[PDB]
C-alpha cells in the first residue's frame with residue numbers, strides 16, 4: 063500500500079506528482095511545481111546541491127504531501143540505454159565508477175535479449191544527496207526514457223490502443239528538447255538536442271526590458287507586437303526543430319512517417335503550437351494529457367493541473383513505479 067513520489071528534476075524547476083490506484087482507476091493525490099534558481103541544474107546535471115535540496119523541500123510543502131519515498135531519473139550524455147543480444151543461460155569510466163543495471167532473442171530462442179542501462183555513480187549519489195536534503199529517500203533511480211513510456215500508455219484516450227501505434231513524442235524543455243519515437247509502446251529512437259523555451263523567454267527579456275522572472279508567457283500583458291514579431295518566430299523555430307528531428311528518425315529506420323505527434327514539456331502549452339507543427343509535418347499533433355482518465359483529490363486544483371499537465375509527463379511516469387521491463391540504477395543492498 064506504499065506508493066512512491068514521482069519527482070522530476072529539470073534545469074529550471076522541480077516537479078512533484080503523487081499517484082494512487084483503486085479499482086483500476088488512477089488518481090492524482092498531490093502535485094506541485096517549484097522553480098529552481100538559475101544554474102542550479104545544467105543540462106539535467108545537478109550543480110548546486112543545496113539549491114536543489116531547498117527547492118525539493120518547498121515542493122513538498124506546496125504539494126501538501128506526507129510521503130518520504132520517491133522515484134527519480136537520470137538523463138543526458140552520461141546515461142546510456144541499449145538492447146543487447148547474447149547467449150542463453152550464462153552463469154565512460156572504469157567500470158568501478160559506473161552504475162549498471164540489466165533486464166532480460168525474439169527471432170531465435172538460442173540467444174537472449176537484455177536491456178541495459180548505465181551511468182556514472184556520481185549522477186546517482188548526488189540525486190540521492192539532493193533528496194536527503196529534503197528528507198526524502200530514493201527507492202528507484204530510473205531513466206527518463208522509460209518514464210516517458212509509462213506515461214505514454216495513459217494517452218490511449220487522447221489518441222485508440224497505444225500498443226499498436228508509432229508515435230513521436232516531443233518533450234520540449236527550457237534548454238533541451240527530446241524526440242522519442244515509440245513503436246507499440248516501446249522506444250525505438252531517441253535524440254536530445256540543445257533547444258528549448260528559454261529562447262522565447264530571453265527574447266521577451268531583451269526586447270521589452272523585462273527580467274527573467276517568464277511570467278508574461280502565462281498571464282500576458284505584453285504589447286500587441288509580441289504575437290507577430292516574437293512569439294510567431296519562436297513557434298516557427300520550434301516547428302523547424304521538430305521537423306528536422308523527424309527527418310533524422312525517418313532516415314535512421316524503416317519508418318517514413320508516424321501516426322501521431324505528442325507534445326510534452328511546459329513549452330508545449332503555447333497556443334496553436336500544436337497546429338503549426340501539424341501544419342508542417344502533416345501528422346495529427348496533440349498536447350499530452352495523462353490525467354484524462356484519472357480521479358482527482360480535493361486539494362488539487364483542476365485548472366492549474368490541466369495547465370501543467372504536459373510538463374508533468376516525466377514526473378507521472380516516475381510515479382507509476384509505485385505499481386507493478388523496469389530499471390533501477392540504485393546499488394542493491
Ligand SMILES: [Cl-]
Pocket residue numbers: 160161162391392393394
Ligand atoms: Cl549501481
Ligand SMILES: [Mg+2]
Pocket residue numbers: 072234235326327328373374
Ligand atoms: Mg518538463
Ligand code: NA
Pocket residue numbers: 092093094124125126361362363
Ligand atoms: Na496542489
